UniProtKB/Swiss-Prot annotation:
Name of the molecule in the record: Peptidyl-prolyl cis-trans isomerase NIMA-interacting 1
Keyword Metal-binding annotated: no
SMART domains to which the protein is assigned, alphabetical: WW
Pfam families tied to this protein: Rotamase, WW
PTM summary: Phosphorylation at Ser-61 by DAPK1 results in inhibition of its catalytic activity, nuclear localization, and its ability to induce centrosome amplification, chromosome instability and cell transformation. Ser-61 is dephosphorylated upon IL33-stimulation of dendritic cells.
Modified residues (Phosphoserine): S61, S98
Function: Peptidyl-prolyl cis/trans isomerase (PPIase) that binds to and isomerizes specific phosphorylated Ser/Thr-Pro (pSer/Thr-Pro) motifs. By inducing conformational changes in a subset of phosphorylated proteins, acts as a molecular switch in multiple cellular processes. Displays a preference for acidic residues located N-terminally to the proline bond to be isomerized. Regulates mitosis presumably by interacting with NIMA and attenuating its mitosis-promoting activity. Down-regulates kinase activity of BTK.
Region annotation Disordered: where it falls in the sequence: 28-44
Assembly with partners or alone: Interacts with STIL. Interacts with KIF20B. Interacts with NEK6. Interacts (via WW domain) with PRKX. Interacts with BTK. Interacts (via PpiC domain) with DAPK1. Interacts with the phosphorylated form of RAF1. Interacts (via WW domain) with ATCAY; upon NGF stimulation. Interacts with PML (isoform PML-4). Interacts with BCL6. Interacts with FBXW7, disrupting FBXW7 dimerization and promoting FBXW7 autoubiquitination and degradation. Directly interacts with RBBP8/CtIP; this interaction depends upon RBBP8 phosphorylation.
GO MF terms, alphabetically ordered: beta-catenin binding; cis-trans isomerase activity; cytoskeletal motor activity; GTPase activating protein binding; mitogen-activated protein kinase kinase binding; peptidyl-prolyl cis-trans isomerase activity; phosphoprotein binding; phosphoserine residue binding
Length: 153
């Protein structure tokens, strides 16, 4: 069973039976879906994301720091941290994207409004149409930087 991109397994050096998604990079214990087939995907969805850029980013520059000096590794250890707070509940997605998203959308809780399967970089797009209304993703790489997409519609 399991929807698109949902696989199971156990993480390294620790026996944990969980659910992974190679399209989203979303990880969780609970099972993703509970008999409905032929579904597929809508032809237009609405997201929000918190983009944190690094050096090998297309435009190594954003409204927060005129010249990005951090490295993928650094930018990644960074997104993880934000993922840490989102899931724990310490801070909420919006509040974070708002304060740190190296994307112009920060000034909008991180919203990007609904878009169709053609306007975004495949890595983002594929993770957006693979998320169900409400579900969030793990780290997603695009030539912009590392993302954290939140499906809102």
């Amino acid at each position: 069973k399991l929807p698109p991109g949902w696989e199971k397994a156990m993480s390294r050096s620790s026996g944990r039976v969980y659910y992974f998604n190679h399209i989203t990079n979303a990880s969780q214990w609970e099972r993703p879906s509970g008999g409905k087939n032929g579904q597929g995907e809508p032809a237009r969805v609405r997201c929000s994301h918190l983009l944190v850029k690094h050096s090998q980013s297309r435009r190594p520059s954003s409204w927060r720091q005129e010249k990005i000096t951090r490295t993928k590794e650094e930018a990644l250890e960074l997104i993880n941290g934000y993922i840490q707070k989102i899931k724990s509940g310490e801070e909420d997605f919006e509040s974070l994207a708002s304060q740190f998203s190296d994307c112009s959308s920060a000034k909008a809780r991180g919203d990007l409004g609904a878009f169709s399967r053609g306007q975004m970089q495949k890595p983002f797009e594929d993770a957006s149409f693979a998320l169900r209304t409400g579900e969030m993703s793990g780290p997603v790489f695009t030539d912009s930087g590392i993302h954290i997409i939140l499906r809102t519609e």
